[PDB]
Structure formats: structure tokens, C-alpha cells
Design a binder for this molecule. Sequence first.
Ligand code: MYR
Ligand code: WPK
Length: 130
Amino acid sequence: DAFVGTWKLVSSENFDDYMKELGVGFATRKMGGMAKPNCIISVNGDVITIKTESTLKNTEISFILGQEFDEVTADDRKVKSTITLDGGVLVQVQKWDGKSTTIKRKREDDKLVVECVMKGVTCTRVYERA
Ligand SMILES: CCCCCCCCCCCCCC(=O)O
Ligand SMILES: Fc1cc2nc[nH]c2cc1Cl
């Protein structure tokens, strides 16, 4: 849809703080902090795939909107994830150990804007088409 494409990270604010609030240790925060991943989003019927590719790590999720799935995150959390579409925004929630974080992906002009929230910390990442 609006989301399908190959996207490259162009900007990020507060991602270290976000990773810290998730419990990510220093070595992994250091690897994530200056990573400039690509995000490849595709759809085949009911099934949406999001690949995230960077020099040191590749991850992938495939899902159906509104159906919970098990996910291993890039920082090795084992989470239960659910993704829905709300007003054109893809809203992902991850739940583990009684905690939750939300990742919202939205299309704005030329950009794919991703907002990640954990407790009082909000991170914003912007991608542009590769
Ligand atoms: C190898 C570096 C891994 C860094 C671990 C980061 C923690 C996972 C949070 C990912 C939030 C997704 C944001 C996005 O799609 O831009
Ligand atoms: F959040 C991330 C997720 C990733 N998955 C693969 N490489 C990545 C780099 C970053 Cl920073």
C-alpha cells in the first residue's frame, strides 16, 4: 500500500534512550545506535512482511493484521506481538514480562515515520525510499 517499498533510515531521535528503557545492554545499544538499516515492506494477500537489514543484523517478521504472533526482537527479547491498521497507521504492540512497547509506522509525504514508545520515552525514526 502506502507502506510497500524499500526504505532507508535517514534520521533518528532518542533511540538510545528508547533502547535503554527496553533494558538493552551497552554493547547492543552501541551496535543499534549508529546502524542505518533498510526496512523492506511487502504484502501478499493477508500476509505482511517487514524485513530490517543492517550490516550487523537482519531481522524479519511476517504477520496477519490483528493476529498475535511470537517475535524475537533485534535485542533478543521474546515477545508477543500484534499489529493492526488504525487510521492508516500500522500500530505494533510487543508484550513480554508484563511490559509493553508500541511501534507506530505512518506514511507522511515522502517519509516512513516510525514512533517507538516505552514508558515515558518516545523515539522517532524517519526512512525515505531507497
Ligand atoms: C544490531 C542492533 C540491534 C539494536 C536493537 C534495538 C532494539 C529493538 C527496537 C527496534 C525498534 C524498531 C524501529 C524501526 O523499525 O526503525
Ligand atoms: F532496530 C534495529 C533493528 C534491526 N534489525 C536488523 N538490523 C537492525 C538494526 C536496528 Cl538499529
